[PDB]
């Protein structure tokens, strides 16, 4: 098995944040570590300005900024989840930006349990050493000497095994730690005066105290006050020597504080996060004494309004506050000095997108083009949502547009102050006084004829080529400098002009014209019998309208005749297919090689490769489109010209190096358009629709907020609705019943129902208990409004959900597998597989089928449904009586959480027994264990890649591929599932789904990869695991090794070590998994450096070959 893991969307969940002077000593910075990625910003007056983003070779787990003595800008310390410590210094050498590494090296220990409450990394305020609490009972101290280039850490044994949080006290003449440890007597705070000289702890400045039983973190107050702040869940305490004062504010008892950050440099004000998004402020009153230091008076908390579920808080300059989120959007709030409404001081300013915890995902196409769009059940808790992720990039009912063009009546402003909008029988000029839009037809242009072209020629004197007549009119001189009328007086369907030359074709008559201001001469009047529907003249480049070569099409087969200019003789006859005449013929030039697009009426485009050297028609690769006519034209986006096709599926043909991309721009329907880069719509071209006049990253993300956590989703084509499984959380009322915290998408659902099951007629809820209520939402596919909300039974959770046709019933059914869970029970004992049917605006419970155990997963199986009933795989047949019936039971699993199927093979991923492959025997009617993986892996997601390859996803962020050991014997040797793939993805994989976000449309271009499996992770990453061939796998492995030899990581971390299959029990090198990011990075490298990789190996093995391999591979991404 050989695969190709690439990242369709980089992770967006925020792990940690820090601020300081990183880029330079003057400009403030904000560093965000979105898992493997690091983002450096500059906090300007208008907000964050992106500067540099680097992909660290590891899961960033510690981020701190320190300023050693003798340094101008602060250094950055990063410690990955695999213990690869490194010190990073920003270095902007000229316009080039790079991050050098001052020190690196592993800090992992062979002996020592990874401590609870995660990795804690602290740096001395004096910036003389670094302390890390990686393991229980140990405290690694890394001296910060300039000569410590390898980060030679030394261990320090300490008595208190269980440490909750470590912090460095400010103002101590020697390095001093302050931590809250736990012993059977209860949580205590004890400080140590660590010394680098003896490499051992000493007695602390102040006596150990007994803190609240749930003290969670330590805040080190700066010099003016000193000491430490110990915030817990109910009380907040301040410890400094003999001074000790505590507060018990009821406003924080509701939920526990998580994040904290210092606001003022003196430490007077502190921010505090929360589970529920609350953003407290911890004020510190200043009590100046007669002669002593400025002691504190008392602590005082305040409520500053609700925000996103905070994972990092970072008080930036002025009053803005960055609030990073792991379960929602990471907004950037502003602390208003005066309360505005509802007692909240925070006003959101710039909400940043975050796909967050993708619980479930499905691939569908709504517009029916074959290009699916991701519909993920993103978010969690109060910030749950439903993102519409799709690849690639003014309705005013009007007749069919016969022509659009920028009428630059401005002298040189290059702004379309007028826009000649033309119909078949009418023509109106759209005057645009800046961003204004009004119709004032100019006196210099007629409207009685359907105009075909109104471009400019020279001396800023425009032309106006109408139907049955041609009338050039100078606009700024306001004089008819040339009124050469059309001698044929026919509809001039073809009117080509560029710079100071115009070559029109009135139906079937080409004329050689030297069209100049006050010079409109009819030198030639050549006329052929064949009609000329489209023709254009374009210069080769900077030349003023000089085109030595020209091409002419035909009618019976549209043979693009190519003639050599020096000879005008036959060199090589060319023939093309297609009987229907093309709608438009366009000469296109994005790269050195030119491409003559042939937009036929059926939508098929034959972009022959035209060459100035030869001009012969190259290979005829066909890009299909809809039956609507396609019109091709050049549009202005950058300094390099580009084209913009128009059809029922508009495509921006943005060609890369030696490759033509046909990405579909997010437009419903376009046939006629004109380029426009005005101030009103800088990025939206003036884009007329089929009958309406409108004006206008690669992974566009829509947001549908739900205000509750979605669990699973599915699509129902028959009903055109979704099947989201959001679960609300409401606090139990003091007088009985439940009261929702906020109005979610479940409450504001038109026509909502309540389940009335009588199966469970056989648990006590306190006033403070928070019971969870699970509903089945039904979301329309177009407006995304909640069409239904079927609340389930009390104390009943919903886990699995599928929509499939069952048995012989033609109706499409909504089947949900629920599970009653009481607080006392460790595992659910009663479940339900309830099947609905969205007939019309309502859900009818057709069947109930009470089961004994949780229904962890469900999926359709050959017209039957099988469910994982709490470590028991049962197969249900849909009887004609509309009742599920048992069949094909299998008691050989332990919490079979995940089921996948393909044909007659079931891949039942277990909880800790790895993947099991089952088989349904039709005539036997019983399940058969074909094969089973044996090494335990703690599965999190499974997928059937092929008939043999079985993808997996360990909860330790590791991917692996099983494969049936065919080369063996049946009796216990063919039952062995042998692992082949091993790969440390670095992200927790939540769901696997087939399909790809890239369109295919029968694009038979010999794709090197087979299949496509998108997966979603907790951090919002979306991958595109594919399958490669043996030769391509070997070539890509060689490329990966060479790139590793050449490319230097930002943290000096070896790629082979980062991608090794890491687990607490084993650590194996990556096998059978080609990294996608590393290979795709080959394109961005400079040519002299790419030559280093290329040299000394295919046969020739030269940079063009490797570049085309990587470019072909990157297309799936």
């Amino acid at each position: 098995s050989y695969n190709y893991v690439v990242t369709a969307q980089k992770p967006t969940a925020v792990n940690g944040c820090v601020t300081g002077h990183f880029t330079s000593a003057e400009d403030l910075n904000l560093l965000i570590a979105k898992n493997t990625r690091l983002e450096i910003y500059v906090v300007t007056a208008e907000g964050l300005r992106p500067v540099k983003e680097v992909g660290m070779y590891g899961k960033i787990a510690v981020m701190e900024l320190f300023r050693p003595k003798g340094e101008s800008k602060d250094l950055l310390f990063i410690l990955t989840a695999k213990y690869n410590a490194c010190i990073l210094e920003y270095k902007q050498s000229g316009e080039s930006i790079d991050i050098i590494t001052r020190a690196h090296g592993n800090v992992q220990d062979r002996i020592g349990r990874p401590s609870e409450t995660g990795i804690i990394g602290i740096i001395d305020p004096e910036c003389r050493m670094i302390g890390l609490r990686l393991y229980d009972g140990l405290f690694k101290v890394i001296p910060l000497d300039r000569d410590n280039k390898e980060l030679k850490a030394f261990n320090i044994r300490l008595e208190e095994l269980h440490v909750i949080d470590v912090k460095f006290l400010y103002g101590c003449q020697a390095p001093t730690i302050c931590f809250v440890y736990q012993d059977p007597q209860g949580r205590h705070v004890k400080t140590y005066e660590v010394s680098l000289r003896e490499k051992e702890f000493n007695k602390g400045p102040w006596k150990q105290e007994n803190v609240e039983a749930e003290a969670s973190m330590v805040i080190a107050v700066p010099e003016p006050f000193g000491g430490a702040i110990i915030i817990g869940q109910e009380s907040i305490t301040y410890h400094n020597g003999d001074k000790y004062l505590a507060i018990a504010p009821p406003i924080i008892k509701q939920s526990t504080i998580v994040c904290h950050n210092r606001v003022d440099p003196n430490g007077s004000r502190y921010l505090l996060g929360d589970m529920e998004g609350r953003l407290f402020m911890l004020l510190l009153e200043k009590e100046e004494q007669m002669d002593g230091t400025v002691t504190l008076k008392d602590l005082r908390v305040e409520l500053l309004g609700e925000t996103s579920i905070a994972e990092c808080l970072t008080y930036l300059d002025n009053g803005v506050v960055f609030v990073g989120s792991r379960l929602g959007d990471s907004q950037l709030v502003k602390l208003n000095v005066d309360s505005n409404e509802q007692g909240s001081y925070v006003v959101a300013m710039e909400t940043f997108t975050n796909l967050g915890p993708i619980v479930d995902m499905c691939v569908v196409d709504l517009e029916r083009q074959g290009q699916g769009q991701l519909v993920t059940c993103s978010g969690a808790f109060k910030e749950g949502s439903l993102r519409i992720i799709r690849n690639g990039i003014a309705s005013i009912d009007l007749p069919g547009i016969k022509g659009l063009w920028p009428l630059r009546s401005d002298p040189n402003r290059e702004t379309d102050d007028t826009l000649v909008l033309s119909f078949v029988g009418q023509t109106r000029v759209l005057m645009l006084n800046g961003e204004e839009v009004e119709e004032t037809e100019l006196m210099g242009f007629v409207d009685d004829q359907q105009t075909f072209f109104c471009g400019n020629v020279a001396h800023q004197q425009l032309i106006q080529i109408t139907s049955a007549s041609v009338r050039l009119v100078s606009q700024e001189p306001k004089a008819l400098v040339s009124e050469w009328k059309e001698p044929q007086a026919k509809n001039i369907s073809v009117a080509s002009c560029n710079s100071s030359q115009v070559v029109v074709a009135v139906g079937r008559a080409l004329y050689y014209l030297q069209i100049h201001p006050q010079e409109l001469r009819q030198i030639s009047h050549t006329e052929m019998e064949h009609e000329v529907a489209c023709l254009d003249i374009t210069p080769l480049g900077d030349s003023n309208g000089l085109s030595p070569l020209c091409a002419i099409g035909l009618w019976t087969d549209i043979s693009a005749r190519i003639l050599k200019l020096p000879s005008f003789e036959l060199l090589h006859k060319e023939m093309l297919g297609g009987e229907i005449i093309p709608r438009s013929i366009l000469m296109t030039t994005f790269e050195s090689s030119h491409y003559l697009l042939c937009a036929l009426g059926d939508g098929a485009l034959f972009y022959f490769g035209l060459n100035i050297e030869t001009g012969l028609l190259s290979d005829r690769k066909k890009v299909t489109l809809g039956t609507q006519p396609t019109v091709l034209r050049t549009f202005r986006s950058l300094s390099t010209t580009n084209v913009f096709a128009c059809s029922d599926r508009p495509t921006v043909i943005y060609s890369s190096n030696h490759k033509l991309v046909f990405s579909n721009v997010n437009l419903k329907e376009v046939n006629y358009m004109c380029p426009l880069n005005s101030d009103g719509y800088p990025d939206s071209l003036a884009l007329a629709n089929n009958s309406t006049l409108t004006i206008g990253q690669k992974l566009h993300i829509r947001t549908v907020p739900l205000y509750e956590s979605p669990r699973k989703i599915c699509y129902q084509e028959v009903s055109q609705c979704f099947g989201v499984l959001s679960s609300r959380i409401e606090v139990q009322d003091t007088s009985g019943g439940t009261t929702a915290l906020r109005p979610s998408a479940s409450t504001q659902a038109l026509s909502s129902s309540v389940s009335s099951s009588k199966l469970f007629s056989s648990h006590e809820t306190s006033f403070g208990e928070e019971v969870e209520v699970h509903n089945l939402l039904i979301i329309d596919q177009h407006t995304f409004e909640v069409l239904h909300a079927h609340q389930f039974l009390q104390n009943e959770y919903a886990l699995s959900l599928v929509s499939c046709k069952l048995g012989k019933d033609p109706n499409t059914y909504f089947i949900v597998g629920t599970a009653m869970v009481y607080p006392e029970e460790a595992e659910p004992k009663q479940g339900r597989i309830v099947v609905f049917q969205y007939s019309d605006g309502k859900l009818q419970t057709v069947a109930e089928k009470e089961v004994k155990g949780a229904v962890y997963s469900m999926v359709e199986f050959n017209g039957k449904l099988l469910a994982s009933i709490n470590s028991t795989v049962r197969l249900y047949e849909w009887t004609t009586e509309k009742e599920l019936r048992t069949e094909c039971n299998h008691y050989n699993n332990i919490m079979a959480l995940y089921l996948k199927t393909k044909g007659d093979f079931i891949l039942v991923g277990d909880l800790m027994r790895s993947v099991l492959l089952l088989a349904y025997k039709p005539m036997e009617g019983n399940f058969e264990e074909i094969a089973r993986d044996f090494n335990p892996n703690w599965m999190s997601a499974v997928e059937i890649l092929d008939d043999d390859n079985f993808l997996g996803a360990e909860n330790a962020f590791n991917l692996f591929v099983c494969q049936k050991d065919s080369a063996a014997t049946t009796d216990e040797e063919r039952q062995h599932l042998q692992e082949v793939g091993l790969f440390h993805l670095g992200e927790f994989v939540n769901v696997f789904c087939h399909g790809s976000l890239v369109m295919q449309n029968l694009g038979e271009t010999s794709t090197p990869t087979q299949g496509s499996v998108l997966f979603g992770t907790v951090n919002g990453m979306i991958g595109l695991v594919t399958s490669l061939s043996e030769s391509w796998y070997n070539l890509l492995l060689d490329m990966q090794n060479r790139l590793n030899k050449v490319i230097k990581s930002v943290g000096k971390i070896e790629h082979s070590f980062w991608r090794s299959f890491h687990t607490e029990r084993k650590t194996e090198p990556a096998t059978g998994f080609i990294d996608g990011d590393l290979i795709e990075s080959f394109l961005d490298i400079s040519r002299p450096k790419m030559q280093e990789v290329v040299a000394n190996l295919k046969r020739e093995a030269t940079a063009d070959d490797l570049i085309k391999v990587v470019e072909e591979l990157t297309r799936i991404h």
Binding site: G137, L138, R157, E159, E160, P357, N892, F934, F988
Partner: protein, 389 residues
């Protein structure tokens, strides 16, 4: 709870409970049942049943299921565990010694096995192709333990009834077919001063226990103890923390996967859980509820370092949760004689080989399908797990 932990994982992500596993699986411990097929009787040379003592799993790739076993006549048999056929389990048998075998150890990452015997010698075996590589000699009495460091496959150490501790190196000169001690710790556990169990925490650190002194000692192998000329001084020494005044002795030593914590059965029917990565010499947890009357009783840890299973002289195996010692243990009834050298399978959480004096090596496996469809009476299942009350 188990269900809530699995349910919350997709949203909250990975959270560290403290042990290797990410879920609390203490609810399913009651499903352990040993079928009648796994009742292998280690028959002796004469044909009468013989009590097997000392039986551990292997670690070679693609073979992390073979369970070796030894008895009082020196027979060593390799047992398949995943397969289900009474006569197919014994695919390898031979005479390791003529004077019983007291311990076994599999070479890490390889299919090589070493037996500790009463012949005052330790053989080196190639189980891939039956042969005797060598016979280490130098002990003045019967051996009692053999330990292999998982970080160094070619170095192993033994502790004999005579009382001194010697570490061998297979890479050393073969000489005349007899291996020679590299470092020797003479009189390691002086107050019949037998070294009950030797263990390897790291490539260099070695942990030992005594049958009479009752103090666990930690030795580093970098220094040479052969020329010490006095009683060697251990780098660390975990003193006896119990209350009984009698001269006690430990019977088994076990570490977790990370090598930090240490579990040591003692004669006072307690399993003290020390910590070897800090200054807290005093024990962390006290597991009790069994009868550790005999030195043959040993224990083993779960693969996720979450549960500790130990033998007992009350014909039962006890499984405590490593985080909650106060909770009553899960008792694996089914044996009529004492249970010794229990070995939880490191490569499979389900398999627990409850090794016994009853002349019956039982392999316990999880049975989550308790309801199932047939019952098979009590003939099918010979062992039932039940929480102690």
């Amino acid at each position: 709870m188990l269900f809530n932990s699995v349910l919350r994982q997709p949203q909250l992500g990975v959270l560290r409970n403290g042990w290797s596993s990410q879920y609390p699986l203490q609810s399913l411990l009651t499903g352990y049942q040993c079928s009648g097929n796994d009742e292998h009787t280690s028959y002796g040379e004469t044909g009468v049943p013989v009590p097997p003592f000392g039986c551990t799993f292997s670690s070679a790739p693609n073979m992390e299921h073979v369970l070796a076993v030894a008895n009082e006549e020196g027979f060593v048999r390799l047992y398949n565990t995943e397969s289900q056929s009474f006569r197919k389990k014994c695919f390898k048998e031979w005479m390791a010694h003529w004077n019983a075998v007291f311990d076994l150890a599999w070479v890490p990452g390889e299919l090589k096995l070493v037996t500790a015997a009463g012949d005052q010698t330790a053989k080196f075996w190639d189980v891939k192709a039956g042969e005797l590589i060598g016979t280490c000699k130098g002990h003045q009495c019967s051996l009692k333990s053999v330990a292999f460091s998982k970080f160094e496959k070619a170095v192993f150490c033994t502790g004999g009834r005579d009382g001194n501790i010697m570490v061998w190196d297979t890479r050393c000169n073969k000489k005349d077919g007899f291996y020679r001690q590299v470092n020797q710790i003479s009189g390691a556990h002086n107050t019949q001063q037998s070294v009950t169990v030797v263990l390897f925490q790291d490539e260099n650190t070695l942990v030992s226990a005594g049958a009479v002194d009752g103090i666990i000692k930690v030795w580093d192998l970098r220094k040479n103890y052969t020329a010490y000329r006095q009683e060697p001084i251990a780098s660390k020494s975990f003193l006896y923390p119990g209350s009984s005044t009698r001269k006690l002795g430990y019977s088994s030593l076990i570490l977790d996967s990370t090598g930090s914590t240490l579990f040591a059965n003692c004669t006072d029917d307690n399993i003290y859980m020390f910590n070897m990565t800090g200054l807290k010499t005093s024990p962390v947890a006290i597991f009790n509820g069994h009868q550790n009357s005999t030195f043959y009783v040993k224990s083993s840890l779960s693969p996720d370092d979450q549960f500790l299973v130990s033998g007992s002289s009350d014909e039962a195996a006890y499984i405590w949760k490593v985080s909650t010692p106060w909770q009553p243990p899960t008792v694996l009834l089914g044996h009529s004689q004492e249970v010794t050298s229990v070995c939880w399978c490191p490569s499979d959480f389900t398999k627990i080989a409850t090794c016994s004096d009853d002349n019956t090596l039982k392999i316990w496996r999880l049975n989550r399908g308790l309801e199932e469809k047939p019952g098979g009476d009590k003939l099918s299942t010979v062992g039932w797990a039940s929480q102690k009350k």
